[PDB]
Symmetry: C2
Subunit: 485 residues, 2 copies
């Protein structure tokens, strides 16, 4: 059952002098125009009556016989182009343009002329291009599986739509969107929406700032093996071994594999993990202190460096800006204390249900007015065997979780660096020391007190932007039910 | 046949007031000294007669009854500490110190005193610590599988050793067991100042690569590795461009299923990848590389001078020459090698000796270690490669070389689905095998090009180190999964 490739039809344009379909680009002299390409964001009342040429997507073609309006897009910016019949623009020019298929990539030359009436659908509202020439670089097939326009609508248009269907003749009509597989089967088309390109710039921002900040602190980026021949569930083991190799402060940005078969609405069997590990001098809170600094940096800088992207996301998926000062520090105990006061029955050493984490978020938001906090001193029974126990009560440990919008983004701990004790705990959690000889043995020859972190990139970005589904924040969505594309 | 963990013995020290083994660190009040920890690099004649306390490794203990010399290390820096019997430092203090095992982590307090005679083995040569207190934070087991000193010697030490035996008393020198006694104790090996330096420079490549491309408004992406595994993150990179991302890079693992052990290849490595839209010509992409690499190369010495210094003592090399960045074509390259006497044929891959040879040719003529070979034969490149308009037996692809050896490979790629599919069939590849990839180019498709760089490769070739395993942190191959 071998499914062949399908190839849909492209339009049959009749080319002319100033309106042509270019030959396939092979980096060849005819594409060496020597022109200056102008970026759409630069189209501004500043340059009325200048001529420009710009390589953009023809998102849409509204057409009027003598006038054709081209809606151009490129990245997060959009503008309007106008082809009008004249002494210098012919019937054949116009009908060429009216027949361009949606999403075709074009080079459009024209004179930027002002518009007394603003163009509400475009980002460049106060100016439009009067075309003098066009060249199709890559002519799109048709019909698209999905319209971009109704991929970009905010729910609100849809709330007001389905409620306008109180009508209970022709209830025409409201508008519809297609389902997460018609978009997943055409993921690359979906990613062209301005919201999506914006979402993944902000994911890129989290990654970049995480790297930039830790580097400014003289951390060393490392790359540990994933073919451990099984995969690296957690890059933790090697991270620790890097510290026993006197690296002092290390981080890794890499894939993390959850063999755990897990589909709720926020978990997957492969994600990208931002990990940190460091020597510790007096106290493991030194490690929590680096996080606070670290995250505050990510959260301070994101709006300074990507204001437009944030703007574009908010239209599609409304959210209010994360409140991250103060960074609240509680203990598991205090948390249990609050939830019980809220009516929950929970017991001293129990992991929290996801709802309970959200409820605690709402408690904390009301009392301290932050979306950002850290839960310290988790129960040993919930944490792994490498976790350093608390000196006052071994039923608790030197570990912590960090929360954004009442939900976990990272988890971390001081770890056991004494081999005898590490092995005692390894047996107490029913784990064969034989299974990880080399790891245990690597702590024998003088061993730094240390702690660290595991952050989910998808998770932090999702929670930063208040987006409820993790799949909207992963580029090519991965899970046990979904392989393609 | 289950091999249990072995745990060797630690010394039995008798602790006191100013010389004690601390209890296991559990982030507890007794460790909250409120002192100021001084970094070894700061120990300088500037602060003679100031008192300091510093957490370092006790690399070595030379002892004299009434005097104990502690050789301290910490990262790439080393210094000397002196414990001397007195009114305030006792017999019991001294014999505690003489019994500290190698590599024990310590907090050493003392007064920094000057030394009229320099201490040649330490990085801090003009000053030493007179100890007033010590606290063992983590006491090491013994014996170590390997001495750190003879892990750090430069090849030259053994040449000069055996030739000094041109000569009764003889100079026996040292030596060190094969790459498995070090691989079986990799974390011990990585403590050598050379090694900690090498991997900071690997880190430097990664960071600068990220920093530069980010300053150019590139977007970092993370594409799935559970595809089977992702041999090349190329397919998804291209799909990100068809998603209007414009300029993307990925830093991630790349998996060579190819069973390959020469002295420079492995079945898992870290790849730095780039992909971008292309307006007029794919040399726009080559232009970003030149800028990109020149940045990595310009910045590395500015930001890590000491690490370079430390590496050069172990493994001598002269600084990479990377200006000019030379651009040749495959044709010109063949022309040079033929003129050098090689018989090669127009569309043949180069043997490794031939690449190194061409490196030598280029060094002699242009005096650079850094170049790019453009216009490779189609027959040697993959089916997504855009062919050259003048001659379809060539293609719009290129390899970049450092010290006459490949560090990256790249190309303009085919963005027209019918033609991509024609080529896909000409290279005997089932289009059905990659429907979604091919179909993703159907709805308007940007001309594009990009790159695949080997991190390990660029850092190895940057530092003139011959074995790739010296430049991978936890060496991986089909014969070596452990460690």
């Amino acid at each position: 059952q071998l499914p062949p490739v399908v190839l849909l039809k492209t339009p049959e344009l009749v080319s002319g002098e100033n309106f042509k379909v270019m030959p396939m680009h092979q980096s060849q002299p005819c594409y060496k125009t020597g022109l200056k390409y102008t970026e759409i964001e630069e189209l501004v009342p500043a340059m009325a009556e200048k001529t420009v040429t710009i390589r953009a997507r023809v998102q849409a073609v509204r057409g009027k016989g003598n006038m054709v309006f081209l809606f151009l897009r490129k990245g997060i910016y959009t503008c309007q182009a106008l082809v009008m019949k004249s002494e210098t623009i012919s019937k054949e020019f116009v009908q060429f343009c009216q027949k361009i298929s949606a999403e075709s990539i074009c080079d459009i030359t024209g004179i930027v002329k002002a518009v007394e009436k603003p163009i509400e659908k475009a980002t460049q509202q106060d100016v439009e291009i009067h075309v003098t020439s066009i060249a199709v670089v890559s002519l799109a097939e048709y019909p698209l599986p999905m319209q971009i326009e109704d991929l970009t609508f905010p729910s609100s248009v849809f709330k007001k739509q389905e409620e306008d269907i109180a009508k209970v003749k022709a209830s025409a009509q409201k508008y519809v969107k297609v389902s997460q597989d018609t978009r997943l089967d055409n993921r690359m088309l979906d990613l062209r929406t301005v919201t999506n390109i914006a979402i993944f710039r902000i994911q890129s921002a989290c990654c970049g700032l995480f790297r930039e900040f830790l580097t400014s602190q003289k951390f060393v980026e490392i790359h540990t093996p994933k073919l451990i021949a099984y995969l690296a569930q957690s890059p933790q083991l090697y991270k620790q071994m890097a510290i026993m190799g006197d690296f002092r402060k290390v981080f890794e940005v890499g894939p993390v594999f959850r063999a755990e078969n897990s589909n709720t609405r926020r978990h997957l069997t492969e994600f990208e993990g931002l990990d940190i590990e460091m020597e510790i001098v007096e106290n493991y809170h030194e490690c929590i202190d680096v996080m606070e600094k670290l995250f505050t940096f990510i959260f301070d800088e994101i709006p300074k460096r990507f204001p437009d992207e944030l703007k574009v996301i908010r239209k599609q998926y409304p959210f209010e800006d994360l409140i991250y000062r103060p960074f609240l520090r509680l203990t598991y105990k205090e948390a249990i204390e609050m939830l019980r006061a809220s009516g929950e029955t929970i017991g001293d050493y129990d992991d929290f249900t996801t709802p309970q984490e959200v409820k605690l978020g709402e408690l904390i938001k009301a009392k301290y007015n932050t979306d950002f906090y850290i839960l310290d001193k988790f129960p040993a029974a919930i944490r792994p065997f490498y976790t350093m126990p608390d000196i006052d009560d071994p039923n608790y440990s030197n570990s912590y979780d960090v929360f954004v919008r009442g939900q976990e983004i990272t988890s971390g701990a001081q770890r056991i660096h004494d081999p005898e004790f590490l092995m005692k705990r390894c047996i107490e959690k029913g784990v064969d020391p034989a299974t990880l000889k080399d790891y245990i043995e690597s702590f024998r020859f003088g061993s730094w007190p240390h702690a660290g972190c595991g952050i989910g990139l998808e998770r932090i970005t999702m929670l930063y932007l208040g987006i409820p589904n993790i799949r909207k924040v992963t580029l090519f969505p991965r899970d046990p039910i979904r392989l393609n594309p």
